[PDB]
Amino acid sequence: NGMLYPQSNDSRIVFPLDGVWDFRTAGEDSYPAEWADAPLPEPLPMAVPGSYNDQNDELNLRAHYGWVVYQRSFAVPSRLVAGQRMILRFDAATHAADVYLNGQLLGSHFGGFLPFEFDVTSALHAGENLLTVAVDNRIGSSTLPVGNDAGTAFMGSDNANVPAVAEAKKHARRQNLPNFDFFNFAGLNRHVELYTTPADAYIADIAITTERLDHIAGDACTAANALIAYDVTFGGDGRQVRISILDGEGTVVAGVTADIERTAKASGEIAIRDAKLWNPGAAYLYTAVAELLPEGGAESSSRIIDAYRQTFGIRTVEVSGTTFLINGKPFYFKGFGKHEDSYFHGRGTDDVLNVKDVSLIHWLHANSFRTSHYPYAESMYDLCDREGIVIIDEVPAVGMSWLQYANPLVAERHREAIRGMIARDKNHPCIVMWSIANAPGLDGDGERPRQAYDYFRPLYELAHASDPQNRPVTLVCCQNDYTTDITERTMDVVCINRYYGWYNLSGDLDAACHALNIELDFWENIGKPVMFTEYGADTIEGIHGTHGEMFSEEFQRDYYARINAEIDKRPWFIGEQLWNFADFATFQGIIRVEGNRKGILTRDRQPKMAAHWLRERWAGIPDYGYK
Amino acid sequence: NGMLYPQSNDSRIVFPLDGVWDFRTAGEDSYPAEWADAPLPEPLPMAVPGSYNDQNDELNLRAHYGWVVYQRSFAVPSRLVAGQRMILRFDAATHAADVYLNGQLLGSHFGGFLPFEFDVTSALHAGENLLTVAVDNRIGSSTLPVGNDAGTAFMGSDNANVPAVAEAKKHARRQNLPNFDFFNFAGLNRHVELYTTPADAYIADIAITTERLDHIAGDACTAANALIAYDVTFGGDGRQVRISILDGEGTVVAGVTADIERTAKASGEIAIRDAKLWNPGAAYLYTAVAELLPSRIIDAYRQTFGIRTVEVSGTTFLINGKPFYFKGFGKHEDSYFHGRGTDDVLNVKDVSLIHWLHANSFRTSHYPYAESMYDLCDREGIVIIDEVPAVGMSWLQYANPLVAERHREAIRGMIARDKNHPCIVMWSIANAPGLDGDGERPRQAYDYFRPLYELAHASDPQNRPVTLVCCQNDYTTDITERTMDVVCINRYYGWYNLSGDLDAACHALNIELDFWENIGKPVMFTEYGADTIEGIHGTHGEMFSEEFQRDYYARINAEIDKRPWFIGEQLWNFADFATFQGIIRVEGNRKGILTRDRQPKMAAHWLRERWAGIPDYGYK
Numbered sequence A: 001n002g003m004l005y006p007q008s009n010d011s012r013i014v015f016p017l018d019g020v021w022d023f024r025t026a027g028e029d030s031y032p033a034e035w036a037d038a039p040l041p042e043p044l045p046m047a048v049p050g051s052y053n054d055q056n057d058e059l060n061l062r063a064h065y066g067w068v069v070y071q072r073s074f075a076v077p078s079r080l081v082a083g084q085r086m087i088l089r090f091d092a093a094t095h096a097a098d099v100y101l102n103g104q105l106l107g108s109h110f111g112g113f114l115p116f117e118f119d120v121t122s123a124l125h126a127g128e129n130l131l132t133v134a135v136d137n138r139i140g141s142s143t144l145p146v147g148n149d150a151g152t153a154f155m156g157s158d159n160a161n162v163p164a165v166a167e168a169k170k171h172a173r174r175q176n177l178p179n180f181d182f183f184n185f186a187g188l189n190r191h192v193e194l195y196t197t198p199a200d201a202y203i204a205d206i207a208i209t210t211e212r213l214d215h216i217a218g219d220a221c222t223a224a225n226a227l228i229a230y231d232v233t234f235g236g237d238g239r240q241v242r243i244s245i246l247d248g249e250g251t252v253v254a255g256v257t258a259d260i261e262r263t264a265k266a267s268g269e270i271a272i273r274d275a276k277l278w279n280p281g282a283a284y285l286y287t288a289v290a291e292l293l294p295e296g297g298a299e300s301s302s303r304i305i306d307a308y309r310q311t312f313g314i315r316t317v318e319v320s321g322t323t324f325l326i327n328g329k330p331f332y333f334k335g336f337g338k339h340e341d342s343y344f345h346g347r348g349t350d351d352v353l354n355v356k357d358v359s360l361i362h363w364l365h366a367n368s369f370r371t372s373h374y375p376y377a378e379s380m381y382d383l384c385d386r387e388g389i390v391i392i393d394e395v396p397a398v399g400m401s402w403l404q405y406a407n408p409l410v411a412e413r414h415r416e417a418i419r420g421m422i423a424r425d426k427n428h429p430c431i432v433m434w435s436i437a438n439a440p441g442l443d444g445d446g447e448r449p450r451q452a453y454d455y456f457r458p459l460y461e462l463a464h465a466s467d468p469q470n471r472p473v474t475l476v477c478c479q480n481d482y483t484t485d486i487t488e489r490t491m492d493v494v495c496i497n498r499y500y501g502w503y504n505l506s507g508d509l510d511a512a513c514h515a516l517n518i519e520l521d522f523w524e525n526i527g528k529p530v531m532f533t534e535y536g537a538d539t540i541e542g543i544h545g546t547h548g549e550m551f552s553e554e555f556q557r558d559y560y561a562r563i564n565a566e567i568d569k570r571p572w573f574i575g576e577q578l579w580n581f582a583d584f585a586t587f588q589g590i591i592r593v594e595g596n597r598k599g600i601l602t603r604d605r606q607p608k609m610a611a612h613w614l615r616e617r618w619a620g621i622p623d624y625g626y627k
Numbered sequence B: 001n002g003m004l005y006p007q008s009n010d011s012r013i014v015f016p017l018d019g020v021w022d023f024r025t026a027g028e029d030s031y032p033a034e035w036a037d038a039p040l041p042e043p044l045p046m047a048v049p050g051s052y053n054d055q056n057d058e059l060n061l062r063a064h065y066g067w068v069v070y071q072r073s074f075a076v077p078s079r080l081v082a083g084q085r086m087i088l089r090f091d092a093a094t095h096a097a098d099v100y101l102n103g104q105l106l107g108s109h110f111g112g113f114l115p116f117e118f119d120v121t122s123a124l125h126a127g128e129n130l131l132t133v134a135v136d137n138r139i140g141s142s143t144l145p146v147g148n149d150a151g152t153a154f155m156g157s158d159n160a161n162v163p164a165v166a167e168a169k170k171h172a173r174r175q176n177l178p179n180f181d182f183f184n185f186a187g188l189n190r191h192v193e194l195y196t197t198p199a200d201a202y203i204a205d206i207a208i209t210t211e212r213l214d215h216i217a218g219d220a221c222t223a224a225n226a227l228i229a230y231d232v233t234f235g236g237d238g239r240q241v242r243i244s245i246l247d248g249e250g251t252v253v254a255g256v257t258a259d260i261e262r263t264a265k266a267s268g269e270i271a272i273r274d275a276k277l278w279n280p281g282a283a284y285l286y287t288a289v290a291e292l293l294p295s296r297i298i299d300a301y302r303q304t305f306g307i308r309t310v311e312v313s314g315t316t317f318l319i320n321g322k323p324f325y326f327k328g329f330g331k332h333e334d335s336y337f338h339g340r341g342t343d344d345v346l347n348v349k350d351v352s353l354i355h356w357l358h359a360n361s362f363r364t365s366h367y368p369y370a371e372s373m374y375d376l377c378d379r380e381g382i383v384i385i386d387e388v389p390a391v392g393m394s395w396l397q398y399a400n401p402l403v404a405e406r407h408r409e410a411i412r413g414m415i416a417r418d419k420n421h422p423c424i425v426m427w428s429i430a431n432a433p434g435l436d437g438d439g440e441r442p443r444q445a446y447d448y449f450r451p452l453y454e455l456a457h458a459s460d461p462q463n464r465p466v467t468l469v470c471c472q473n474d475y476t477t478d479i480t481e482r483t484m485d486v487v488c489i490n491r492y493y494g495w496y497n498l499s500g501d502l503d504a505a506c507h508a509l510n511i512e513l514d515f516w517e518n519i520g521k522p523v524m525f526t527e528y529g530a531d532t533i534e535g536i537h538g539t540h541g542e543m544f545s546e547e548f549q550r551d552y553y554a555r556i557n558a559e560i561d562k563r564p565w566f567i568g569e570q571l572w573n574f575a576d577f578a579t580f581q582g583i584i585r586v587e588g589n590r591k592g593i594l595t596r597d598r599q600p601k602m603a604a605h606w607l608r609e610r611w612a613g614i615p616d617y618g619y620k
């Protein structure tokens, strides 16, 4: 179950396989088997990592439906593979992939936003190796994220009662129809790499938890004592593992040698005196170095069999009444939902962009975001660990309704996504909360609200069982009839998406604020902490008015000014994450002006009027103690 | 019923009352009547003509609901009023007005897009006169154009099932909710003027018709003989009227003296040898000069006209016996600052753009336009489909006799005002009403519209074709559109349905074209298009890009070219225009092939090239 990010050290090496690959589009329902067994005929170039859709303007790959096939060759010195365990890792292949090496299927995966890997020790050979990866972009009623098997995309226009329209639909070209509001970018969206570990015995997983903090300082920078726990899992086959705790300067401040017991694990606790805590706006990271010792322990030899360096931060998270406590201090979220989205790359990971976006989060005086609507690339979490930005980590369970709740295949994929996200991400101190879905159907009459609850409650429990830190769990709720939804109010933090004054009461900020206050009165009675995870207004940079109407920069600024003045009056409202950080691509349609334009930044990360207004507001709101 | 545009001549003078007036906003359902008795307190400035909504950025007058009050003073020499009939004309007050002069209520008008006038001979006095005009902008289920009494504006987003939304609606500020897709600009949108006629007897109305053309030239520039008819109505009280026909150079080419009979009318026919005909792309105008006789002239009026016939014949639309093809668009009277206010600089520019595009026609979507625009199109050879403000209609309106009454007023009023223009070739009695469905609904719509079709025919002395512009609907259960003289359809295949899929859009369009092929009427587009933000570009153009709009017209027009019975392409729209705000309107309607500032998008260039190669006559 461990998926530690590949590391290079004295016992391990990583060989990236990124670069310009060969590529062919394939069929709507299948691809040629022979393409895995020999070089692709007449290949196109395709950079990896990246979405494929915007990498070829001769083709219309945004319209592609079905399979594509990637391929490349590689060779490595025999000297480096000898005696080692060889693993091929795919950080993400969106949505489903079949991976072949030298004409043999290594295996398959479903789930477009989480990593998977194969043991290729026996499949590799000397000299050039031929790696082929078939990737399927199709979405439908059984995928996460969810597609529509017929009709229109989410937020699509129709005239379904016109006989000519009904007839033309029957014969129209097959297309993915997202039941979600972001473009279905597909392909090898994240890195590919070959890596090595020792074969006889190796470190397979590490979990670090902050179990307890004693006498936390007034400023939350330190605690008199921190109790941390480690759990190390091994693969392979009186053995021991040395655990060293390094502080921010790399000095060993704690260390223990633990017995490995059988499935093989070592676990224990370590007390850290005068512990330096991790906080939003004030990151501090330690490293847990795990070193597998040879048979005979340190008593017999100085050599190290295997090693892995796991970053971690010491901090607690606790929901208490209507507060969200980090290191016992009442936190207030400032930020937004994001997307992994950019020109050229699509959903492809881009660390230049991640580094820039983290600086923009600081420029705005924001302190947090949500990984709307899928787990992000691993590097972004490491960056937010070092930069003191809090994350709500969310699985790709977007577009769901009652059709999905009855389907065992969907429930299995949903559990896989929750387990996989938490297994990948559990050691990040920046992650303070898990989201098990975005905007599923929860309300209505008859049995529908109960059916939704019965689907989601076990997933809430799974997210708690899976996280060794036991962080809060939420479900991000779409604008709905909050009085018949019986699921959202059971979450640990209530996370609501609301578009009062945009999708309803349009343009009337007085009415919008009145409606918002009626719903806030409902949440006030429930007595849980509540935050916005979405609210906003599509905004075309450069459209201006003295009395700003919808789509103007002024309306977007006025929107936030009015709504935020209302939530400031509620002590139990513990965060404001708006929609969205930046404009992003969507399926085309009559309400999407070259995608979603609710960004406070443009797609090129330039600030609209509302961004300047929010920057000034957020400059004056502290991370702790605002409420 | 005559509403001849005010003229100055030896017998008549016009005194314009345009300029910067005083202005105050008033209440949702009332205004202070006493404001007519003294200068408005603390007035704002307000230019007339113009909509008021965009003339004050300290206020949000786009949000205004109810009444406003205009006022100004004027004085004219006693010498000018002596012995004359004094008439105060409002070219348009949108939507309803109460008019006072020196504190006396002259009367009221309902209907925001047609002229009305008052005899103020007795209310005028020497020196300064105080003119107060209260204007009501309210629209609702009994007005034309139609407003919604509750819910949202047309094409508005909602979450009606959210309890907080339902409750907030109950208490929200009252607003007009258009059931139409253009902003509800209000105020004194067109000119105001005082004018004079003789009092004892005067010319009240003139109708000129083209009755028959003999031996029309191959190129339709002339006919060996044209038989025209005149009908002159008089007001006041063996009298006679002199009718002189002036050609384009002002030469009197024909003349007759007719007896006036009592209701007081003179009528007759005149034969014009080697008549110069009016054609799209080749205007020629005559003037009929009517002079009431006692060397003296008692009264006079100069009525421009053009000699031409219009005939629907099978699946053809014949102008002077030639098969015409419409190229053009729906327009709007819409611009920055002015709103719906008439602007003849803009009208002159727009007519030049119609020529730049090689278009030949437009429709007055969705209300009669200012009179000056029709005069301009008369002289510039641009054909017009003239439409009343019956937009936003459905079964709630058809059951309401007040709406039918207003609809009849609008049809009679438009045709009475506009009947003499040669550029007008067809009348439209509605845009996008509800016509389809189950049960009694299609028959109820037909029973409502058929008498209005008959009224438009009865009212027009030229007996021009009459249509009803149909919104995308279930054409198989609509039983009304197919009975019109020309079938005029608004279709948005590939935009509002089959979105972005031009192959599917063309397949669907062709299925509906197969339906119309069997009906056997002439058919044309009056709307089709795609919102387009200038500057948004793609190599594979998606919705809102300039390329998608160009590709849209390229694909759709290739299909209608294959149908010989499809006699015109009027797209939506000439230029981007203002609407009520909402999630599908990016600062208004962006289906213009031109921007709101009349700059050409990619599609405008593509259409210009297409239209350059399509002749006015004989394309099909």
Ligand SMILES: O=C(O)[C@H]1O[C@@H](Oc2cc3ccccc3oc2=O)[C@H](O)[C@@H](O)[C@@H]1O
Pocket: A181, A182, A373, A438, A439, A477, A478, A479, A497, A498, A499, A503, A534, A579, A596, A598, B158, B159
């Ligand atoms: O609409 C967006 O910009 C985002 O919408 C979110 O889901 C919601 C959509 C609607 C639509 C109509 C009325 C109320 C709504 O409230 C919502 O909460 C979605 O989570 C985002 O991914 C979309 O981008």
Ligand SMILES: O=C(O)[C@H]1O[C@@H](Oc2cc3ccccc3oc2=O)[C@H](O)[C@@H](O)[C@@H]1O
Pocket: A158, A159, B180, B181, B182, B366, B431, B432, B470, B471, B472, B490, B491, B492, B496, B497, B527, B572, B589, B591
């Ligand atoms: O939508 C417009 O741009 C114009 O719409 C016209 O009416 C129609 C609206 C719709 C909506 C959805 C599907 C099909 C439609 O077909 C129509 O004909 C209206 O005549 C114009 O005034 C609008 O601006």
